[PDB]
């Protein structure tokens, strides 16, 4: 028989990995934040002469050779390559020996908003140029958005939970929350969890341009400017973040080095507009409150907010309103999309890494680029330079296309 | 403060909705099963002259006019239309008054494996024929796989959890399991949950043909033949199933009519091959056992298995092996993909409806088409005609591309 009651478990972070426009190790990634070096510049992945958008945050130095060989491009779109690299880096960082685990209690969640969209565009064209017999056998294994999760599970022998979650910009915030809840409620002992996106393509840029969602600002240093009066759309980035989560008991029993604790998760829905956030941040308020309630902390204990902060007029008006409503005007807020661009399905995972690293360095990274915050924005937006401070608890927001709100609360470790 | 312990809740089904190749109401859908009328025939959605596959299970009578008007095609791909129709039908069936609910405790999960893939193919072509300025503004709101969930939430004012899950063929089995766990652990009181797919398109058929995953059998009555010695690939279907799940307390307090109870969920990963299931069903065995353990039932109590049963050599060899290993050679097994085709991300939701309807009618639907089961298959495969019997508990399997195994256990209600 099963018990009537479940005794809750604590959940800790033991390692992480990243490939991104500002670095491919936590040390490189943090150094960019601490020195004020952004990753936005002119697009190089395709000819963008006919577009209205000419900037993106690219990974121009992906360390392909560390783990892969040429034949791996037959099997993996970049959206999977990025996840596999970040997952191996996270396993290494955690000093996790996957051959010593209970593999039935080891799971994987790899979120993505769009999946292998380069593969889709290129094979649609091949179909219509050459006919159906010439579509590549590996088209769907490369393209379908769940495949990165299955690929990561195969690499590490994870026989437990394996899934992908899609909530657009919230996808990897929801992934980390779901993995946290799995471990908290006793289903798994170890989860590799995060997100990945590789959507700097003609089609995906054209689609977001058609939605009027992208900044058309020519100067790459003035294009991603969250909370700034001149903001006018997001700048697309690419990459992956992956975290190792463990039960506290599992981590301590094996002598792991613990990097942070996950303590709360809030997920709500605006049920308001298909792509615009609620203008007063109504769903965002409720998501923040849920995360704090689960973590058993008061608003005054939150010492940093890593904002969703995509650099749109509507987003930061509501998001500042939501943060002020729940937490007030003193808590420091910054958006690191000013450095990384908008990583879409990978945004929550990379921003969880930002938040953990901020707690471990006693340092709130600035919002790069921003100079003049809108008059009506009442939140304590950090810009110009970062802030030295103790950060015992912090939250990271994502408020995504489709109305999906997700907030994670983290606690500094001992 | 939060408790140290969570008191578990029971979870019940109060309504469901369906659009599918064998019907667009539970009554039509069941009647097709009870009379032996399949939904597979020649493709009509595109010119398939150049293809090797000429059959599919289409919805050729979608009741567009019941809820939609012409302008809705500007906003919604068919993958969202199908989900919105099935969700409204489920709400109606449940006699759920969405204006009387706690909307913060009302959530939505709409699974999909591929999302608005017609929109993607058609707008890729527009991009390359006319240039980026001519890509339609609603391209990504129509295409992205999370949008159906957000659309359903907006229709009903669901302000709680809103997400999409992608585990290919397992997507809506995992969706229903996730919603079940949310309610069981006290996060939500009511969830609208299921899946949707609209992938009978040149691109998606060409992709599955290139994977060698589709039956090339010309006779539509011999193409989807799960467990049969002549099986040679799946037949693609389309549509959506949506269920209303409630806590037992919420359902009884409002005087709902209860249709079934959800009692267990097992999710594991083969971590074996990217698209082929483990040949001996090793991950499937563990997923079945997890569902039974959570439901607190013994193997002998399972009275029907709705198989994954896609009509591939490798699938049914391992799946029969897994069923025999855990449950033995007497429990009746049938695959209704013989009627509906493979609904991909919608398969688990429509098959949950099959399973519930079987329990409510005291009737195991047959596997249509199949005549001669492979010599090595030891499971009690029902074919030729369905079986009259009491079904107090039942399970439904999905074992999807990427290694994702999901099993749901249901209990008949009082
Ligand atoms: Mg660098
Ligand atoms: Mg954030
Ligand atoms: Mg009919
Ligand atoms: Mg099934």
PDB file of N, CA and C in Angstrom, chain A residues 54-121:
ATOM      1  N   UNK A  54      18.460  43.135 -38.075  1.00  0.00           N
ATOM      2  CA  UNK A  54      19.817  42.823 -38.516  1.00  0.00           C
ATOM      3  C   UNK A  54      20.735  42.398 -37.363  1.00  0.00           C
ATOM      4  N   UNK A  55      20.201  42.307 -36.130  1.00  0.00           N
ATOM      5  CA  UNK A  55      20.951  41.910 -34.946  1.00  0.00           C
ATOM      6  C   UNK A  55      20.356  40.671 -34.278  1.00  0.00           C
ATOM      7  N   UNK A  56      21.233  39.947 -33.574  1.00  0.00           N
ATOM      8  CA  UNK A  56      20.868  38.774 -32.784  1.00  0.00           C
ATOM      9  C   UNK A  56      21.974  38.509 -31.785  1.00  0.00           C
ATOM     10  N   UNK A  57      21.739  37.663 -30.798  1.00  0.00           N
ATOM     11  CA  UNK A  57      22.777  37.218 -29.878  1.00  0.00           C
ATOM     12  C   UNK A  57      23.104  35.784 -30.263  1.00  0.00           C
ATOM     13  N   UNK A  58      24.236  35.593 -30.977  1.00  0.00           N
ATOM     14  CA  UNK A  58      24.638  34.296 -31.480  1.00  0.00           C
ATOM     15  C   UNK A  58      25.701  33.667 -30.621  1.00  0.00           C
ATOM     16  N   UNK A  59      25.772  32.344 -30.685  1.00  0.00           N
ATOM     17  CA  UNK A  59      26.928  31.591 -30.215  1.00  0.00           C
ATOM     18  C   UNK A  59      27.856  31.477 -31.436  1.00  0.00           C
ATOM     19  N   UNK A  60      28.938  32.239 -31.435  1.00  0.00           N
ATOM     20  CA  UNK A  60      29.840  32.247 -32.602  1.00  0.00           C
ATOM     21  C   UNK A  60      31.089  31.407 -32.407  1.00  0.00           C
ATOM     22  N   UNK A  61      31.200  30.795 -31.237  1.00  0.00           N
ATOM     23  CA  UNK A  61      32.349  29.983 -30.822  1.00  0.00           C
ATOM     24  C   UNK A  61      31.900  28.641 -30.179  1.00  0.00           C
ATOM     25  N   UNK A  62      30.809  28.039 -30.681  1.00  0.00           N
ATOM     26  CA  UNK A  62      30.318  26.805 -30.042  1.00  0.00           C
ATOM     27  C   UNK A  62      31.444  25.755 -29.987  1.00  0.00           C
ATOM     28  N   UNK A  63      31.741  25.162 -28.815  1.00  0.00           N
ATOM     29  CA  UNK A  63      32.865  24.175 -28.744  1.00  0.00           C
ATOM     30  C   UNK A  63      32.463  22.781 -29.241  1.00  0.00           C
ATOM     31  N   UNK A  64      32.133  22.712 -30.532  1.00  0.00           N
ATOM     32  CA  UNK A  64      31.638  21.482 -31.198  1.00  0.00           C
ATOM     33  C   UNK A  64      32.598  20.307 -30.926  1.00  0.00           C
ATOM     34  N   UNK A  65      33.906  20.573 -31.029  1.00  0.00           N
ATOM     35  CA  UNK A  65      34.919  19.494 -30.992  1.00  0.00           C
ATOM     36  C   UNK A  65      35.077  18.896 -29.606  1.00  0.00           C
ATOM     37  N   UNK A  66      34.566  19.531 -28.561  1.00  0.00           N
ATOM     38  CA  UNK A  66      34.803  19.000 -27.224  1.00  0.00           C
ATOM     39  C   UNK A  66      34.169  17.615 -27.108  1.00  0.00           C
ATOM     40  N   UNK A  67      32.915  17.491 -27.567  1.00  0.00           N
ATOM     41  CA  UNK A  67      32.147  16.245 -27.471  1.00  0.00           C
ATOM     42  C   UNK A  67      31.705  15.607 -28.779  1.00  0.00           C
ATOM     43  N   UNK A  68      31.714  16.333 -29.888  1.00  0.00           N
ATOM     44  CA  UNK A  68      31.071  15.859 -31.121  1.00  0.00           C
ATOM     45  C   UNK A  68      32.094  15.641 -32.224  1.00  0.00           C
ATOM     46  N   UNK A  69      31.660  14.874 -33.204  1.00  0.00           N
ATOM     47  CA  UNK A  69      32.387  14.648 -34.455  1.00  0.00           C
ATOM     48  C   UNK A  69      31.489  14.976 -35.624  1.00  0.00           C
ATOM     49  N   UNK A  70      32.028  15.127 -36.826  1.00  0.00           N
ATOM     50  CA  UNK A  70      31.239  15.553 -37.967  1.00  0.00           C
ATOM     51  C   UNK A  70      29.979  14.738 -38.191  1.00  0.00           C
ATOM     52  N   UNK A  71      30.044  13.420 -38.011  1.00  0.00           N
ATOM     53  CA  UNK A  71      28.889  12.600 -38.246  1.00  0.00           C
ATOM     54  C   UNK A  71      27.708  12.910 -37.330  1.00  0.00           C
ATOM     55  N   UNK A  72      27.973  13.526 -36.183  1.00  0.00           N
ATOM     56  CA  UNK A  72      26.871  13.915 -35.280  1.00  0.00           C
ATOM     57  C   UNK A  72      25.898  14.930 -35.885  1.00  0.00           C
ATOM     58  N   UNK A  73      26.317  15.710 -36.873  1.00  0.00           N
ATOM     59  CA  UNK A  73      25.369  16.592 -37.544  1.00  0.00           C
ATOM     60  C   UNK A  73      24.324  15.838 -38.393  1.00  0.00           C
ATOM     61  N   UNK A  74      24.583  14.569 -38.691  1.00  0.00           N
ATOM     62  CA  UNK A  74      23.581  13.752 -39.362  1.00  0.00           C
ATOM     63  C   UNK A  74      22.411  13.409 -38.472  1.00  0.00           C
ATOM     64  N   UNK A  75      22.666  13.411 -37.181  1.00  0.00           N
ATOM     65  CA  UNK A  75      21.719  12.933 -36.182  1.00  0.00           C
ATOM     66  C   UNK A  75      21.071  14.052 -35.348  1.00  0.00           C
ATOM     67  N   UNK A  76      21.776  15.174 -35.194  1.00  0.00           N
ATOM     68  CA  UNK A  76      21.395  16.229 -34.260  1.00  0.00           C
ATOM     69  C   UNK A  76      21.326  17.593 -34.960  1.00  0.00           C
ATOM     70  N   UNK A  77      20.175  18.292 -34.874  1.00  0.00           N
ATOM     71  CA  UNK A  77      20.059  19.732 -35.142  1.00  0.00           C
ATOM     72  C   UNK A  77      20.872  20.479 -34.073  1.00  0.00           C
ATOM     73  N   UNK A  78      21.217  21.748 -34.312  1.00  0.00           N
ATOM     74  CA  UNK A  78      21.877  22.525 -33.265  1.00  0.00           C
ATOM     75  C   UNK A  78      21.058  22.582 -31.974  1.00  0.00           C
ATOM     76  N   UNK A  79      19.737  22.552 -32.043  1.00  0.00           N
ATOM     77  CA  UNK A  79      18.975  22.621 -30.798  1.00  0.00           C
ATOM     78  C   UNK A  79      19.285  21.448 -29.875  1.00  0.00           C
ATOM     79  N   UNK A  80      19.553  20.261 -30.438  1.00  0.00           N
ATOM     80  CA  UNK A  80      19.996  19.133 -29.627  1.00  0.00           C
ATOM     81  C   UNK A  80      21.479  19.242 -29.253  1.00  0.00           C
ATOM     82  N   UNK A  81      22.339  19.677 -30.178  1.00  0.00           N
ATOM     83  CA  UNK A  81      23.785  19.826 -29.856  1.00  0.00           C
ATOM     84  C   UNK A  81      23.978  20.713 -28.631  1.00  0.00           C
ATOM     85  N   UNK A  82      23.278  21.832 -28.597  1.00  0.00           N
ATOM     86  CA  UNK A  82      23.444  22.778 -27.487  1.00  0.00           C
ATOM     87  C   UNK A  82      23.056  22.122 -26.165  1.00  0.00           C
ATOM     88  N   UNK A  83      21.944  21.378 -26.160  1.00  0.00           N
ATOM     89  CA  UNK A  83      21.481  20.705 -24.950  1.00  0.00           C
ATOM     90  C   UNK A  83      22.417  19.608 -24.495  1.00  0.00           C
ATOM     91  N   UNK A  84      22.947  18.833 -25.439  1.00  0.00           N
ATOM     92  CA  UNK A  84      23.866  17.750 -25.106  1.00  0.00           C
ATOM     93  C   UNK A  84      25.163  18.316 -24.515  1.00  0.00           C
ATOM     94  N   UNK A  85      25.714  19.379 -25.091  1.00  0.00           N
ATOM     95  CA  UNK A  85      26.894  20.039 -24.566  1.00  0.00           C
ATOM     96  C   UNK A  85      26.604  20.543 -23.136  1.00  0.00           C
ATOM     97  N   UNK A  86      25.518  21.306 -22.962  1.00  0.00           N
ATOM     98  CA  UNK A  86      25.245  21.889 -21.637  1.00  0.00           C
ATOM     99  C   UNK A  86      24.998  20.791 -20.617  1.00  0.00           C
ATOM    100  N   UNK A  87      24.315  19.701 -21.002  1.00  0.00           N
ATOM    101  CA  UNK A  87      24.073  18.594 -20.084  1.00  0.00           C
ATOM    102  C   UNK A  87      25.382  17.892 -19.674  1.00  0.00           C
ATOM    103  N   UNK A  88      26.272  17.645 -20.636  1.00  0.00           N
ATOM    104  CA  UNK A  88      27.544  17.038 -20.243  1.00  0.00           C
ATOM    105  C   UNK A  88      28.316  17.949 -19.308  1.00  0.00           C
ATOM    106  N   UNK A  89      28.368  19.244 -19.606  1.00  0.00           N
ATOM    107  CA  UNK A  89      29.025  20.188 -18.703  1.00  0.00           C
ATOM    108  C   UNK A  89      28.399  20.170 -17.302  1.00  0.00           C
ATOM    109  N   UNK A  90      27.062  20.095 -17.206  1.00  0.00           N
ATOM    110  CA  UNK A  90      26.424  20.041 -15.895  1.00  0.00           C
ATOM    111  C   UNK A  90      26.781  18.776 -15.103  1.00  0.00           C
ATOM    112  N   UNK A  91      26.775  17.629 -15.763  1.00  0.00           N
ATOM    113  CA  UNK A  91      27.167  16.355 -15.151  1.00  0.00           C
ATOM    114  C   UNK A  91      28.610  16.437 -14.634  1.00  0.00           C
ATOM    115  N   UNK A  92      29.495  16.978 -15.466  1.00  0.00           N
ATOM    116  CA  UNK A  92      30.888  17.178 -15.056  1.00  0.00           C
ATOM    117  C   UNK A  92      30.999  18.069 -13.830  1.00  0.00           C
ATOM    118  N   UNK A  93      30.320  19.210 -13.878  1.00  0.00           N
ATOM    119  CA  UNK A  93      30.342  20.180 -12.789  1.00  0.00           C
ATOM    120  C   UNK A  93      29.878  19.558 -11.460  1.00  0.00           C
ATOM    121  N   UNK A  94      28.830  18.741 -11.521  1.00  0.00           N
ATOM    122  CA  UNK A  94      28.237  18.085 -10.358  1.00  0.00           C
ATOM    123  C   UNK A  94      29.047  16.921  -9.878  1.00  0.00           C
ATOM    124  N   UNK A  95      30.061  16.528 -10.646  1.00  0.00           N
ATOM    125  CA  UNK A  95      30.814  15.298 -10.352  1.00  0.00           C
ATOM    126  C   UNK A  95      29.862  14.118 -10.137  1.00  0.00           C
ATOM    127  N   UNK A  96      28.860  14.059 -11.005  1.00  0.00           N
ATOM    128  CA  UNK A  96      27.854  13.017 -10.963  1.00  0.00           C
ATOM    129  C   UNK A  96      28.373  11.821 -11.746  1.00  0.00           C
ATOM    130  N   UNK A  97      28.418  10.653 -11.107  1.00  0.00           N
ATOM    131  CA  UNK A  97      28.838   9.421 -11.759  1.00  0.00           C
ATOM    132  C   UNK A  97      27.590   8.646 -12.166  1.00  0.00           C
ATOM    133  N   UNK A  98      27.192   8.787 -13.431  1.00  0.00           N
ATOM    134  CA  UNK A  98      25.917   8.233 -13.884  1.00  0.00           C
ATOM    135  C   UNK A  98      25.886   6.697 -13.838  1.00  0.00           C
ATOM    136  N   UNK A  99      27.064   6.069 -13.795  1.00  0.00           N
ATOM    137  CA  UNK A  99      27.157   4.602 -13.629  1.00  0.00           C
ATOM    138  C   UNK A  99      26.984   4.121 -12.160  1.00  0.00           C
ATOM    139  N   UNK A 100      26.944   5.033 -11.204  1.00  0.00           N
ATOM    140  CA  UNK A 100      26.743   4.690  -9.792  1.00  0.00           C
ATOM    141  C   UNK A 100      25.293   4.966  -9.305  1.00  0.00           C
ATOM    142  N   UNK A 101      24.472   5.565 -10.161  1.00  0.00           N
ATOM    143  CA  UNK A 101      23.110   5.945  -9.785  1.00  0.00           C
ATOM    144  C   UNK A 101      22.134   4.807  -9.910  1.00  0.00           C
ATOM    145  N   UNK A 102      21.018   4.941  -9.211  1.00  0.00           N
ATOM    146  CA  UNK A 102      19.804   4.193  -9.561  1.00  0.00           C
ATOM    147  C   UNK A 102      19.216   4.838 -10.830  1.00  0.00           C
ATOM    148  N   UNK A 103      19.473   4.240 -11.979  1.00  0.00           N
ATOM    149  CA  UNK A 103      19.057   4.829 -13.250  1.00  0.00           C
ATOM    150  C   UNK A 103      17.542   4.937 -13.415  1.00  0.00           C
ATOM    151  N   UNK A 104      16.758   4.150 -12.682  1.00  0.00           N
ATOM    152  CA  UNK A 104      15.301   4.286 -12.704  1.00  0.00           C
ATOM    153  C   UNK A 104      14.795   5.524 -12.000  1.00  0.00           C
ATOM    154  N   UNK A 105      15.638   6.109 -11.168  1.00  0.00           N
ATOM    155  CA  UNK A 105      15.291   7.296 -10.400  1.00  0.00           C
ATOM    156  C   UNK A 105      16.049   8.556 -10.874  1.00  0.00           C
ATOM    157  N   UNK A 106      16.592   8.457 -12.090  1.00  0.00           N
ATOM    158  CA  UNK A 106      17.353   9.508 -12.785  1.00  0.00           C
ATOM    159  C   UNK A 106      16.564   9.879 -14.047  1.00  0.00           C
ATOM    160  N   UNK A 107      16.142  11.145 -14.127  1.00  0.00           N
ATOM    161  CA  UNK A 107      15.324  11.632 -15.234  1.00  0.00           C
ATOM    162  C   UNK A 107      15.870  12.848 -15.894  1.00  0.00           C
ATOM    163  N   UNK A 108      15.217  13.243 -16.981  1.00  0.00           N
ATOM    164  CA  UNK A 108      15.649  14.346 -17.878  1.00  0.00           C
ATOM    165  C   UNK A 108      14.440  15.147 -18.354  1.00  0.00           C
ATOM    166  N   UNK A 109      14.502  16.480 -18.264  1.00  0.00           N
ATOM    167  CA  UNK A 109      13.531  17.343 -18.933  1.00  0.00           C
ATOM    168  C   UNK A 109      14.329  18.358 -19.739  1.00  0.00           C
ATOM    169  N   UNK A 110      14.130  18.391 -21.052  1.00  0.00           N
ATOM    170  CA  UNK A 110      14.770  19.397 -21.896  1.00  0.00           C
ATOM    171  C   UNK A 110      13.629  20.176 -22.594  1.00  0.00           C
ATOM    172  N   UNK A 111      13.378  21.388 -22.122  1.00  0.00           N
ATOM    173  CA  UNK A 111      12.372  22.273 -22.687  1.00  0.00           C
ATOM    174  C   UNK A 111      12.852  22.877 -24.005  1.00  0.00           C
ATOM    175  N   UNK A 112      11.944  23.228 -24.904  1.00  0.00           N
ATOM    176  CA  UNK A 112      12.216  23.991 -26.125  1.00  0.00           C
ATOM    177  C   UNK A 112      10.916  24.598 -26.631  1.00  0.00           C
ATOM    178  N   UNK A 113      10.974  25.835 -27.118  1.00  0.00           N
ATOM    179  CA  UNK A 113       9.785  26.471 -27.682  1.00  0.00           C
ATOM    180  C   UNK A 113       9.488  26.126 -29.121  1.00  0.00           C
ATOM    181  N   UNK A 114      10.530  25.800 -29.901  1.00  0.00           N
ATOM    182  CA  UNK A 114      10.385  25.630 -31.349  1.00  0.00           C
ATOM    183  C   UNK A 114      11.082  24.387 -31.886  1.00  0.00           C
ATOM    184  N   UNK A 115      11.994  23.787 -31.153  1.00  0.00           N
ATOM    185  CA  UNK A 115      12.677  22.593 -31.608  1.00  0.00           C
ATOM    186  C   UNK A 115      13.602  22.833 -32.780  1.00  0.00           C
ATOM    187  N   UNK A 116      13.759  21.816 -33.628  1.00  0.00           N
ATOM    188  CA  UNK A 116      14.734  21.888 -34.712  1.00  0.00           C
ATOM    189  C   UNK A 116      14.204  22.587 -35.933  1.00  0.00           C
ATOM    190  N   UNK A 117      13.941  23.892 -35.771  1.00  0.00           N
ATOM    191  CA  UNK A 117      13.287  24.690 -36.788  1.00  0.00           C
ATOM    192  C   UNK A 117      14.159  24.921 -38.020  1.00  0.00           C
ATOM    193  N   UNK A 118      15.494  24.911 -37.902  1.00  0.00           N
ATOM    194  CA  UNK A 118      16.357  24.963 -39.090  1.00  0.00           C
ATOM    195  C   UNK A 118      16.095  23.710 -39.949  1.00  0.00           C
ATOM    196  N   UNK A 119      16.076  22.537 -39.321  1.00  0.00           N
ATOM    197  CA  UNK A 119      15.808  21.292 -40.046  1.00  0.00           C
ATOM    198  C   UNK A 119      14.465  21.340 -40.763  1.00  0.00           C
ATOM    199  N   UNK A 120      13.447  21.862 -40.095  1.00  0.00           N
ATOM    200  CA  UNK A 120      12.131  21.939 -40.733  1.00  0.00           C
ATOM    201  C   UNK A 120      12.166  22.832 -41.972  1.00  0.00           C
ATOM    202  N   UNK A 121      12.666  24.056 -41.845  1.00  0.00           N
ATOM    203  CA  UNK A 121      12.722  24.963 -42.994  1.00  0.00           C
ATOM    204  C   UNK A 121      13.504  24.333 -44.158  1.00  0.00           C
TER     205      UNK A 121
END
